[model samples]
Target: TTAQHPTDEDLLARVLVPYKDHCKYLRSAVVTEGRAVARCEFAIPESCYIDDTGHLNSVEVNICYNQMMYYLVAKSVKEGLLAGFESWTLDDFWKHQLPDILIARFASNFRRPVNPRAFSGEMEFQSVTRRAPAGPFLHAETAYRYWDADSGRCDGEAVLAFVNI
Candidate 1:
């Protein structure tokens, strides 16, 4: 959470920890579909169930995609690619990089604010592949599979894709 941006490897390693130990089990990660893409498999934790009436009302999963994008955005702004725009929505950045083969898969709900402290979630970087000229990109399909305690079933999954732009 430091203003200091960490490398993609560092970020991926940190992000994978919780997903492997905390969320569920990461199966395997590989690239698919696009000519340049990286894909990963993750098992959603059964404990993701939320019990509003019980106690745990909501959960925020900080998948690594956000971390890598934030770092890329910061670096882009510093180097000046999508210039004049001092700031942008995650969508904007995603669109700009799509042509470059950047992708993120996740739930829209999880796209909200990420607390500088106590960020939790389970995710894996399926593939850190690259298409020349674009250099490198991070690709993954992460799910925000949650259980509604009241409902007593897994809510669903939120998938996302992201990469360095």
Candidate 2:
């Protein structure tokens, strides 16, 4: 069996467009052979918060942001898989040094924190240790923290299940 590579045009439309349209804050989007990257610069809506039910009040906004980060990484991983890199590792993602670049871009554009210095971020890619699908997959958890002064430190976490589809 052979797997096909996704065209740049397809990713531009299928991944980039939808992400930008969903997030007006997106400054720019670029799709390469193995990645879909986006830059977002805007303020998080004051209304964006978690509800009493422990769910995001503005689910669409957060999910779109999370997807922006996930799509690019997923695309790269997919490309590798198709190219026969069966032994991919977390270093594979970091090898490109995307985490620092992407997160810094997000921080520069994001206006949720009160002061520019009141923000911090983290990203983690952990292999799925549990018994499940017999393929290369990972659990990506990304989070950011900000200080409101009034409400203290506020943060958010978004988990993405990266798998071959």
Candidate 3:
């Protein structure tokens, strides 16, 4: 059996548009592919619908921001699976350099913690982008980006799922 690759138009009509419309927290998902490659980007917003204390409420800047990281990681895991390079059920990030690239957020000059940062919910996803196959040999230099509005800067997070060694 042969698996069919998604067309750019199809991805936009199906995945990107739907995600943007339904998920208030989601701004957009960009899907790009060539004959040899496939990729996507998802934009997340600052606020998300969180159910707490038996009510649907929004969290503070700190809380929402943290949530974004989890979203990014989860999404990254999904992207890897779609690309057929990695899986959430399997934890072999150490075995794959590409996944490591897509794993977490990094510190920028605009935002200071001097350490790797995640997201809190009350912010936006500005944008998230990545390529497929995980390689220089295959899917090389793929990336996803996130932004912390409170911090007023965008973070371009790369998604890699490992290629060679």
> Best candidate per lDDT, number?
2
Candidate 2 ranges beyond 4 A from true positions: 1-14, 19-24, 29-57, 78-137, 145-154, 163-165
Off by over 4 Å in 1: 1-55, 61-105, 108-135, 144-151, 161-165
The ten-residue window of minimal lDDT in model 3 covers: 114-123
Candidate 3 lDDT tens digits, 1-165: 433233234223332222335343322332222111222223333224543332112232222222233333334444452333343432443234233434233332223221112232222233333434543323333223333323433333332333332
Q: 69-164, model 1: which lDDT tens digit per residue?
A: 333443344333222223445445545543543334344342233331222332222233322353233333333322221332222233333334
Which predicted model would earn the best TM-score? Answer: 2
**How would the candidate models be sorted by TM-score, starting from the highest?**
2, 3, 1
TM-score quality measure for candidate 3: 0.26
lDDT of residue 109 for candidate 3: 26
Provide the lDDT at 145 for model 3: 30
lDDT of 2: 0.37
List TM-scores for all candidates, in order.
0.24, 0.35, 0.26
Candidate 3: residue 138 lDDT (0-100): 30
Give the candidate order by descending lDDT. 2, 1, 3
Candidates 1 and 3 compared: the better one by lDDT is 1
